[PDB]
Design a protein around this nucleic acid. Structure first.
Ligand SMILES: [Mn+2]
Ligand SMILES: [Mn+2]
Lengths: 295, 929, 295, 93, 295
DNA sequence: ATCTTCCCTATTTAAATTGCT
DNA sequence: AGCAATTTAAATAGGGAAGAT
């Protein structure tokens, strides 16, 4: 149905499902499933999303883009977007890359800001862990998890190279995997090819994390070819680097809870998008990328 | 590339193929699509149009030639898209198909009459030895022969009589004898040990009367009386009417059986036997469940009683009848029209336009492609196959890696895996490292392809991956041993799959000279069997000997005589297509093949001789070949080098010879910077493969990319001491070679490993031939028998290569192409030609090539063994730890340039050398120390 | 999964008008108001433009973006005079190759390397002219075109800024517009809002080269927010910078021929597919932009 | 003059027009004919395709423009030949 | 009953091979020996041919003849050098225009008039070369072809006997056949019983030109039984003059091109249709016999 | 809403047979 | 031998309903 997502401060990423978007009486509306029309205010939204069962028309597209309301096509849920155009400074007056994009590029270029931003993305990944506290998952304030957190903090702060950061990131990620395996009474080893519940649930949750990180990178105009940790030849490595922030804080406890209770995949999708809507995870990633790129 | 796809399909199989074909092409209406797409788009459209299910009725046209035809859609013979096709088109005097139907039906209702003895009943129930004293096929043959001796076997009531033990069941009646041989050899063929019988027997019945019970059926023989006391519970309704209708069918058609020739009878009975094992294995594979008890034929996996013998005989009959129908009335699935073939060859491929001199409407074709290496022989073979229309062929090649090379050529030029099927039946662990994404190589085993309609008559829907790739391949790029079993096997049903493969597909055999003599005999047997069904044989060998080319033509001519008299057509002759890089010649040859072939050979020789001599060979005078190798290495480095860096190939004969030359050269004190490699075949999986890839990338001299795989900065002698593994299937280019003489085709092939890629002529001498083989010091009576055609029956009078070879000679294919039978005792070339005409002769013998009468027996598969080697046990290296008596050793570390280590893999050791330790080493594999 | 066709090897391109694009039994098909459902080869489509009166569902965008089809709309800022925002959704769900972004932005940030790259893309105009010749129009080897190409190269060699570049563009394009017009015996003033065929066919070819240029950009991962030409009238970004390589070589001769030989919009559209696949212009632009970024 | 005729008729009338359209053009299969004919050939084909009865559903294309459209066949607005035709298209005020 | 289609604008063209020709449900068709029934467009067919294994019926022949389709049978050649005998069913039930036969008779009976017509028809092949120029093969206006046709015209101008015409005919055929052989770099000898593709493509074109010539002669009512060129070697009728007017202009370069490119026979059938249709070779022959008859 | 699957729904094609000329 | 009438039946198209996202 109609879904509101706060992204930066005031603009809202509207998600529209099972509706036909067109122009009625000179302004953009949409007929919904229940046969009731709903209009959209142009002032409070910049991102508008078209989920499953949704069609838009040409003059609705044109009038939405002329009002600064830039449209994207997404899979139902609002965090699995497959089609959009690039954010500019203004949609009609000029065509310039966003300040965030340019800042990211400059930071990526000079080697020192790239290393500092790699350290910072891991700092905010540890922050994400504490910030987004779950109920079924392990305690972030537990002594073993806090020891892993301080080990990662020491290792990131004392490192001067990227391959050290990759080893430390892998140690932290799989150490949280080991901690959640110690919670849920299983021998868990992370492999994509396994058909067990924990590994495949973590895989499709990671794909959801890639989708929401892709939406967060798109919404500030950040391109998908400037990874911090991963190599220059890794296709879409920045999506993986941004999704790393919430892979071990949100996706991992939800996936282990989902494999523990053993429910099906669509209701895991609704749990993931419910956690994304409730705690504003996309807005957290948007502010994370602003604080990374602004420096 | 502009294509147009039309659909003939009923169902919603005109609907769920429409989604995929409308994903790639625009819709022009009326279930017709048309548009532009890439060749990889054609491959993707093929892969997701075939995999979508059964019943897809799709014809594609590229310009106006048909690209592909999914299913058995008749589509186009002249025009495309017919109107309604109903029934009753031709209805001739089919005769021989009615003959095969009658023989297969009569034999298949009698093939398992011999399981009714009490011994087979307690064998199935399991209180005696599971191996019978006399096999049940022979007991059923005894039943049928006793019934024929008693009553008139063609028109009478059946009733199984009291049968005794008979040593022979073959009489004089030609048709009864056919039924008896089909009954007895529905599991294995009879084997004749008798030397006089093997010497003299030629005809159909006159050989079949020598097939006794002692040829494999009579295992041990102590419970014969229980093996011949038989119940007669088969007399039921449907069995008796099926037997009556098939016997009367045979009765009505056997009048054309006596008008056949010997060649016909043999080929027709081979087809009948193949269809009979097809039906028998098809009914034995599936579980039917129901049974009427008191008698049983087969057992399930649990050993319970199933498939009672009346319905077992009826099921084997109908399955064999249906096998025969689908193998005798099949329009087989052919390959795509490859668009990168049909254009002109440019430059050095410009001779490949010789296909524009061949008729495109000939039913038969015997290509002898005498073109030299590096001219694109296999591409020219594919061009010749595609000149007659769509391609359906079996590229049978020696070695796994040569099949890989032809597959990679087929992949990168135009052929996808929807038409090609690379088959190597060993599952080797040679993987490509470095970069999986940036490979663009390593042709693999997937075969999206198209499953043929012949899979339903094979046992348990053919098989899994391998036999689906075998049978259903339009183009089958395979190792040759998946095709030579078509001529027949000892035990089992391994004949049927290559038989039915070669029935509807052409045969392309490349470099047949590298095979053995018995291997070439069974390959020409395969050529005869392929020509028996009108398919075309392409032979591609530059160094062909007239003898070989002749006996392959005579095998094709006997096969085309079988095919011509089988369809009741008058035999006009064989369309022989002589081909080389200088021209082509297509003649309708029914007789005088020898003068035309030798005239083409002489024309090719005169087209080779006015070209500049590329291989000047000097036979050394130095007796001792160790120091002859030393002096020749020094001389050919001081004469033939690229700025101080030279590449030498010491071709020797055997493995301990190779390690002897290596250990001498490593301990050889000289000012030359010798860097020694060992390149024989006894090596562990890892080590061997590593040598191959390195050598292929350092001896590539079409460019200067090798300067970075070796140290060419310092003047260095890069020497590779190798056995005949270098002269077969290796695209290597050495600066010079020192050859230990074993055979003249070895001389020509190792000349082909020198200046293979360059075009610069040598000035003085680029080949130094050794004075003697090293077996002269071990056996002066015979020394050239190892990797040569010298033997105990063909002995050279002198072993001196001044006596048996020219001292200075330009080595090319001319000496092998000419053919000389005189003075074979004191020249190597005439010794070679002698053996080739004295083993591959136009006789039937028993191990020969025209084999007639013996195809009925197991003799051509026992005494003519394909890949006849020594015992060969395999010592296996498991993670650094050897299995048997191996004992790893340390090499001399004097001049080794490259040494790759190995941990897994296996080495093939002859049983003779198993007695002692093979002493595996990292540098050189096996030796005697 | 297979190779799924290289996007340079896709040959079908469409700009649909007055239709409802949807999925019927897994088929990308546009339905008109007369009840006619025409399918689209979505695995072979380069782009689908959407004209006025058009509409597309979610699932059609879902299986066009999965097959790598760029979908734009010809209204909004599609009046082509300002050329501000032609609403152009790209498939960024596929994680693109990154190295062309890296070499492109290394030369972008460096303004001297951007100036040199602009000169290379300005020389690509005359390269396109020489490579893609037409046998129904202006001969490239006559004295006027050779003189103006020589003047263009000697002006762009001694160029100093992007303001100097903007001017050279004025000359080339305007005078090639004019030179064709005098040879086609037509008083012609380029106007995106003009009704004559010489302008409506030119705007249709503008949208077609827009689609080819944007597909060539997205293929390499290159966006649009990194243009090489900066000016007052050059609003629109990198897609027009790539597209105006092939106005005067391809789009303008086809449009002029079409108007002169009285073609209909449908056949001009098809003449555009025939020239874009017979000379393989998409692979031309893709390989040439690899030459542009390279190091 | 090179033309292409596509037919989507129902009943035995589809077969009766196939005799006349197969008297003048070659059959490319799937109820589609395509070939070279003359100007007056197209006319004789029109005269004996229309007179054969009611319900003839014939579209002809000369190069790529539609030559003729027998009946009220919607045929081409932009592309030619639909698929899942059906009702309730627009239904306005 | 309308204008019944004039013969010079009839376009379809076949030689049917290994199929029994019949009538289903109204139309003439051919049924091969696999069940395939392909319809013959009898109202637009110029000629059909019947190869080995063909069998036509009575009412099929009637529907071809009453519509006016000349039908021959390809086999019958039994000599070593000559295309011996081709059996050809004339549609005489259509009563023919008469005065063109009277003009042909008044030129045939007068010996000096037959010689004069023999003269102009020998230079008719020379002008055929000049008019019908292919895009491939040789160029007609080179020095060798112009020198040989100039020697041919000079010799046929001073000719006074039909045996001199036969000799000059032989030198002309040897000159052209061998020059084409030189161009296509092959050795050529014209044998009708040869397996080489340059030869049986020439015999297929012999059958094609035979059918074209009887349709041209029957369209004006001219019989084959009035050969204006006669001799011991040249004994086929008028078809062996109006058929080999167009060997060295149409068929022989097309046969050599088809035997050089080397696909099947069907591309040669379709190429003969394409060149006999595009240049209107049938109407060209009819109009040439028209300007022959009234002069 | 969009799209899919399935059940009517009967409308719509292809085959089959067989006097008749 | 082609065809016509005329049956017979297999299949194609479409609309409505319900279940998914
Ligand atoms: Mn058995
Ligand atoms: Mn059995």
């Amino acid at each position: 149905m109609q879904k509101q997502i706060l992204t930066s401060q005031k603009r809202n990423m509207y998600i529209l499902s099972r509706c036909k978007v067109l122009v009625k009486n000179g302004q953009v509306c949409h007929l919904h499933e229940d046969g009731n029309v709903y209009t959209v205010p142009y002032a409070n939204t910049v991102f508008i999303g078209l989920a499953e069962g949704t069609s838009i028309t040409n003059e609705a597209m044109s009038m939405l883009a002329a009002n600064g309301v830039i449209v994207f096509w997404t899979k139902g849920g609002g965090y699995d977007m497959f089609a959009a155009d690039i954010i500019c400074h203004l949609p009609q007056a000029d065509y310039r890359p966003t300040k965030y994009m340019q800042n990211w590029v400059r930071l990526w270029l000079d080697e020192e800001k790239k290393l500092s931003a790699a350290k910072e993305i891991l700092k905010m990944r540890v922050d994400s862990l504490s910030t987004h506290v779950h109920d079924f998952g392990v305690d972030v304030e537990n002594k073993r998890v806090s020891s892993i957190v301080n080990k990662f903090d020491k290792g990131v702060t004392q490192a001067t190279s990227f391959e050290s950061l990759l080893g430390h990131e892998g140690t932290f990620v799989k150490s949280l995997y080991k901690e959640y395996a110690l919670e849920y009474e299983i021998e868990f080893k992370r492999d994509h090819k396994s058909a067990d519940n924990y590994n495949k649930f973590l895989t499709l949750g990671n794909y959801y994390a890639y989708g929401i990180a892709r939406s967060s990178l798109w919404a500030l105009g950040i391109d998908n070819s400037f990874p911090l940790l991963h190599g220059s030849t890794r296709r879409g490595g920045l999506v993986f680097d941004v999704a790393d922030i919430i892979k071990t804080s949100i996706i991992l406890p939800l996936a282990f809870h989902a494999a523990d209770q053993g429910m099906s995949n669509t209701e895991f999708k609704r749990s993931c998008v419910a956690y994304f809507d409730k705690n504003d995870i996309l807005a957290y990633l948007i502010n994370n990328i602003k604080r990374l790129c602004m420096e | 590339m502009f294509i147009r796809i039309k659909c003939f399909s009923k169902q919603p199989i005109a609907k769920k193929v429409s989604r995929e074909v409308s994903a790639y092409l625009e819709y022009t209406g009326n279930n017709t699509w048309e548009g532009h797409i890439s060749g990889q788009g054609v491959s993707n459209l093929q892969t997701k149009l075939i995999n979508v299910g059964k019943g897809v009725k799709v014809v594609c046209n590229y310009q106006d030639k048909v690209l592909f035809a999914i299913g058995n859609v008749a589509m186009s013979d002249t025009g495309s898209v017919p109107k309604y096709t109903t029934k009753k088109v031709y209805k001739p005097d089919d005769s021989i198909f009615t003959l095969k139907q009658g023989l297969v039906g009569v034999a298949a209702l009698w093939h398992d009459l011999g399981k009714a003895n009490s011994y087979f009943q307690r064998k199935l129930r399991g209180e005696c030895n599971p191996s019978d004293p006399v096999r049940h096929e022979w007991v059923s043959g005894v039943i049928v022969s006793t019934f024929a001796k008693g009553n008139d076997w063609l028109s009478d009531d059946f009733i199984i009589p009291e049968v005794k033990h008979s040593d022979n069941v073959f009489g004089d009646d030609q048709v009864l004898n056919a039924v008896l041989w089909l009954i007895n050899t529905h599991h294995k063929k009879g084997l004749v040990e008798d030397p006089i019988y093997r010497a003299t027997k030629t005809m159909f019945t006159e050989t079949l009367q020598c097939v006794n019970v002692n040829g494999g059926w009579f295992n041990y023989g102590d419970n014969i009386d229980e093996c011949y006391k038989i119940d007669t519970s088969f007399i039921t309704d449907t069995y008796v009417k099926q037997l009556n209708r098939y016997r009367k069918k045979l009765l009505a058609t056997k009048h054309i059986w006596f008008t056949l020739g010997e060649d016909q009878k043999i080929a027709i009975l081979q087809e009948c036997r193949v269809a009979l094992m097809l039906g028998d294995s098809n009914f034995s594979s599936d579980l039917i469940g129901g049974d009427g008890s008191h008698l049983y034929a087969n057992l399930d996996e649990c050993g319970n009683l199933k498939q009672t013998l009346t319905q077992h005989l009826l099921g084997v009959t109908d399955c064999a009848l249906k096998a025969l129908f689908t193998i005798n009335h099949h329009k087989p699935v052919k390959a795509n029209f490859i668009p990168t073939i049909a254009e002109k060859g440019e430059g050095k491929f410009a001779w490949q336009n010789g296909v524009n001199m061949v008729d495109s409407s000939i039913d038969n074709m015997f290509c002898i492609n005498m073109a030299s290496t590096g001219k694109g022989k296999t591409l020219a073979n594919l061009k010749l196959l595609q000149h007659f229309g769509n391609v359906r062929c079996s590229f049978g090649l020696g070695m796994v890696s040569l099949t890989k090379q032809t597959a990679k050529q087929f992949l990168d030029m135009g052929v996808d895996y929807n038409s090609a099927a690379m088959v190597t039946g060993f599952s080797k662990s040679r993987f490509n490292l470095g970069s999986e994404s940036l490979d663009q190589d390593e042709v693999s085993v997937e075969y999206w392809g198209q499953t043929s309609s012949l899979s339903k008559v094979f046992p348990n829907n053919n098989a899994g991956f391998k036999n689906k790739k075998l049978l259903s391949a339009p183009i089958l790029v395979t190792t040759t041993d998946h095709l030579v079993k078509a001529s027949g096997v000892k035990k089992g049903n391994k004949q049927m799959l290559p038989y039915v493969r070669c029935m509807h597909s052409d045969l392309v055999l490349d470099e047949i000279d590298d095979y053995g003599i018995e291997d070439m005999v069974v390959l020409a047997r395969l050529v005869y069997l392929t020509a028996c069904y009108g398919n075309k044989v392409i032979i591609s060998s530059a160094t062909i000997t007239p003898a070989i080319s002749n006996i392959f033509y005579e095998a094709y001519s006997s096969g085309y005589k079988v095919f011509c008299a089988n369809k009741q057509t008058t035999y006009k002759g064989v369309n022989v297509v002589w081909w080389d890089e200088f021209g082509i010649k297509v003649e309708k040859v029914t007789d005088q093949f020898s003068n035309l072939n030798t005239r083409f050979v002489n024309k090719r020789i005169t087209n080779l001789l006015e070209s500049t001599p590329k291989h000047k060979a000097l036979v050394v005078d130095q007796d001792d070949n160790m120091e002859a190798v030393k002096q020749s290495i020094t001389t050919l480095h001081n004469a033939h080098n690229s700025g101080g860096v030279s590449f030498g190939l010491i071709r020797t004969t055997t493995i301990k010879d190779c390690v002897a030359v290596t250990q001498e050269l490593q301990n050889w004190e000289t000012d030359l910077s010798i860097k020694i490699l060992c390149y024989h075949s006894r090596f562990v999986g890892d080590t061997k493969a590593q040598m191959e890839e390195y050598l292929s990338k350092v001896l590539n001299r079409k460019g200067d990319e090798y300067k970075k795989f070796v140290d060419t900065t310092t003047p260095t002698a890069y020497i590779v001491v190798a056995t005949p593994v270098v002269e077969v299937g290796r695209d290597f280019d050495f600066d010079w070679a020192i050859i230990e003489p074993s055979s003249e085709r070895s001389i020509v092939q190792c000349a082909g490993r020198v200046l293979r890629h360059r075009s610069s002529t040598p000035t003085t001498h680029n080949i130094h031939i050794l004075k003697y083989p090293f077996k002269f010091y071990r056996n002066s009576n015979i020394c050239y028998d190892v990797a040569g055609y010298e033997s105990k029956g063909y002995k050279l009078k002198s072993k001196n290569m001044l006596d048996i070879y020219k001292k200075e000679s330009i080595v090319n294919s001319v000496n092998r192409l000419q053919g000389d039978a005189a003075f074979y005792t004191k020249s190597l070339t005439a010794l070679e030609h002698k053996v080739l005409l004295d083993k591959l002769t136009t006789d039937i013998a028993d191990t020969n090539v025209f084999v007639g009468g013996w195809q009925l027996t197991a003799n051509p598969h026992e005494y003519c063994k394909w890949r006849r080697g020594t015992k060969n046990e395999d010592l296996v290296l498991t993670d650094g730890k050897w299995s048997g008596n191996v004992t790893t050793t340390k090499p001399i570390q004097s001049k080794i340039w490259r040494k790759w280590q190995g941990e897994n893999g296996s080495i093939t050791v002859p049983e003779y050398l198993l007695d002692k330790t093979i002493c595996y080493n990292d540098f050189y594999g096996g030796y005697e120390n």
